[PDB]
Amino acid sequence: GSSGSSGTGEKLYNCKECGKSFSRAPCLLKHERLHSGEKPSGPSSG
Ligand SMILES: [Zn+2]
């Protein structure tokens, strides 16, 4: 019963794919994007 979030953005950075809590938020947010399925085969254009 102690609900109270100080701020404007009520979001908690945390990877659910592999399940790992990084120390750096910035790096964590990017880590969540790194989880793009399996075998990221880009377009390889050019
Ligand atoms: Zn992860």
Swiss-Prot record:
Known tissue expression: Ubiquitous. Mainly expressed in fetal tissues.
Organism this protein belongs to: Homo sapiens (Human)
Function description: May be involved in transcriptional regulation as a transcriptional repressor. The DEPDC1A-ZNF224 complex may play a critical role in bladder carcinogenesis by repressing the transcription of the A20 gene, leading to transport of NF-KB protein into the nucleus, resulting in suppression of apoptosis of bladder cancer cells.
Name this protein carries in UniProt: Zinc finger protein 224
Compartment(s) where it occurs, according to its Swiss-Prot or TrEMBL record: Nucleus
ZnF locations on chain (C2H2-type): 13-35
Subunit structure and binding partners: Interacts with WT1. Interacts with DEPDC1A.
Similarity remark: Belongs to the krueppel C2H2-type zinc-finger protein family.
Organism classification: Eukaryota, Metazoa, Chordata, Craniata, Vertebrata
UniProt cross-link Glycyl lysine isopeptide (Lys-Gly) (interchain with G-Cter in SUMO2), position: 30
